[PDB]
Amino acid sequence: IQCSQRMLSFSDALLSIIATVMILPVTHTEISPEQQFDRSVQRLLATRIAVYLMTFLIVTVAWAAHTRLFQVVGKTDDTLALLNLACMMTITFLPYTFSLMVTFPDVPLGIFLFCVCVIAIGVVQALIVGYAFHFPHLLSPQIQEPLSKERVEAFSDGVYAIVATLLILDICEDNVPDPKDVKERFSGSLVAALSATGPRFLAYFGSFATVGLLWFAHHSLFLHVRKATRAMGLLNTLSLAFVGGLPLAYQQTSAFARQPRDELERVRVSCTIIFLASIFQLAMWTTALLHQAETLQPSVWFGGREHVLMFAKLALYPCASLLAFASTCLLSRFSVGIFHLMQIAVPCAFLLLRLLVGLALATLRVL
Amino acid sequence: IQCSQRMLSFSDALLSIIATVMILPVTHTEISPEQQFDRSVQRLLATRIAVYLMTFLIVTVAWAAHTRLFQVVGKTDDTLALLNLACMMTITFLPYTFSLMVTFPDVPLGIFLFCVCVIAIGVVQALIVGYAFHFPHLLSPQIQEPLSKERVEAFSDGVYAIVATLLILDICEDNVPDPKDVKERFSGSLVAALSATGPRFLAYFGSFATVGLLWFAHHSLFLHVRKATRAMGLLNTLSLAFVGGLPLAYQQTSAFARQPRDELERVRVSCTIIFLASIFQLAMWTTALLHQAETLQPSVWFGGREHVLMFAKLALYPCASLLAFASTCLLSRFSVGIFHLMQIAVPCAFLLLRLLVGLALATLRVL
Ligand SMILES: [K+]
Ligand SMILES: [K+]
Ligand SMILES: [K+]
Ligand SMILES: [K+]
Ligand SMILES: [K+]
């Protein structure tokens, strides 16, 4: 009998990467002035967005089934490990079945291979169940509906890491020039080029800061979580689905970004994505506050020491993005600058969150 | 005081992905008959290969420094978590500095920004050390040279997962056709197309099986490892570096694959990569057998129950790849078929490894 921790971690990594890499087609969508107000391509963009959403949700359902199964298994074996690898192999093909369905929705091939993949996952999981039940020692101690916190955390970490990787790759592929366009830039000089490249580098830092602070909020929340509800699982799945779309909000090479659009509505889109990624973490926290006793640790209960701190940590980004959107709709003038300033202010607020919360609540105290 | 497990797992995931995604430039290298025997582009391919190797090794050195640091830290904090995120952000930029150096090696800009990134990583880690030492409770229990097995395992898992993702993405982007080339294929019929697409799908299954079986061997080895040596760490780093090159051996869209080359030498290249990825795992095992007492569990010691099983598990792929290369050099006729057959036989051998080993050693016993 062997421990199953590492195998499940590998499965979580693979599944998270598979669910998150469906955003690349969306980033690669190209609209330029040839189709400025073309309806077909403009709705094609939303088509690809929705396709990404559904593929992510399907892969997440598969991951949840895997979690429920290896909650029952408990201890792994060589045969069980190879069967798990087969299941991973079958799951990895679902994105391809969707990728064949997108181009020819009416012709039934994609239908056929998608159903085949699903039924194959089913038979593989059933074989795992049978092999485990045949040998008692391979079953869980209790058998021999909460989700597992470790698997949720691993999936979330994988998604966030893949997002950051996408950002850095965008930068690396855009900015790096080659010679003759270099000396068409300047006196064969790449220092002038470099500082003509600086805002791009610093934008990368800003986007990575956004993603890392969202991960920090999720990590702080789940450090204080005793048990993970199914509702919290759904809300985390939605939060991660909208986190996967952050590259679309922060990218330069992406043919999505290279399209005719004003600064104000790009700010609106980015703030929409950020708000949707954050409000679901806040919703997880609110839902857990419903039965703290089973879902939360005593420190963050109503009237606890770190209750206000956690609430502020989770409500920082929602409020900032919402007020930036409100600036877009209200001011009409200083919106892009307000977005830039928010991307700078939120990190420092996270760094000095404790002092801010303390002095703020004292102020509210005596006045 | 908070637990540092999840933060370190996230760091490992990010670093593994960053180290492994440098292979994409190598896959995207394009050579076609315009430059059939051009020396410049042919050596440019090896240039990009070496660049990938060095970038991987540098990122691995950074990851090892991070491991050594948070071996001393032990318990994390909000400030320490944000500083760790800053360190990750700084490390993610190293691939970009190399990406700017590749195009202009002589101009000193890449030099400058690479040195700046390294010194920034240094100051961030020094600040973490100082903040930790200032507060005793944030230090390790003992302080208040073996590597950590958990971090090694996480890094390896990330690398393998990224490789599998690259493979599936290759398939998805190549094969999916669009309409007018569909009905240029056939009677507007995508079933004929599909079975004109089948060898590609099944090649994906084969490559994923290769990667998953290598991961299975690594997992079985490290399940029986009590302590991880520095030499074992170096050998694992080399094994992972050559594992990252498996997509180059198994890919179809990659402009690397779409170049003039015979089947025999492509087989040779793939078998070379596989042998280099496997011999280093076998070397880790041999090195650990030098001081089993501290590095290995009793079950796999000389004369143990699972000693022969582990040796066979780790020597399966090396011998198969070596004999396929030997077929290429000797037979000259049946080499490609032998490679295809090996890609089928090795998995089943892994599935029936125990029975094979048992009956083989009994045979050798009485005869
Ligand atoms: K884990
Ligand atoms: K991961
Ligand atoms: K881990
Ligand atoms: K990983
Ligand atoms: K990628």
Residue numbers in the entry:
A (entry chain B), B (entry chain A): 30 to 173, 254 to 476
Passage from the reporting paper:
TMEM175 is implicated in cellular proteostasis and its mutation is associated with the development of Parkinson’s disease through a yet unknown mechanism, underscoring the importance of this channel to regulation of cellular homeostasis.
To investigate the mechanisms that govern hTMEM175 function, we collected cryo-EM images of hTMEM175 purified in 150 mM K+. To better understand the functional states of the two conformations resolved in our data sets, we next superimposed the class 1 and class 2 structures determined in the presence of K+. Overall, the two classes are very similar, with an all-atom RMSD of 0.9 Å. In contrast to the rigid cytoplasmic side, differences between the two classes can be readily detected on the luminal side of the channel. When viewed from the luminal side of the channel, the ends of the transmembrane helices in the class 2 structure are rotated in a clockwise manner compared to their positions in class 1. The luminal loops between the transmembrane helices also adopt different conformations, with the loop between TM9 and TM10 undergoing the largest change. In class 2, the last turn of TM9 is unwound and moves nearly 12 Å from its position adjacent to the loop between TM11 and TM12 in class 1 to interact with the loop between TM1 and TM2. Identification of the ion-binding sites enabled us to tentatively assign the two conformations as an open state and a closed state.
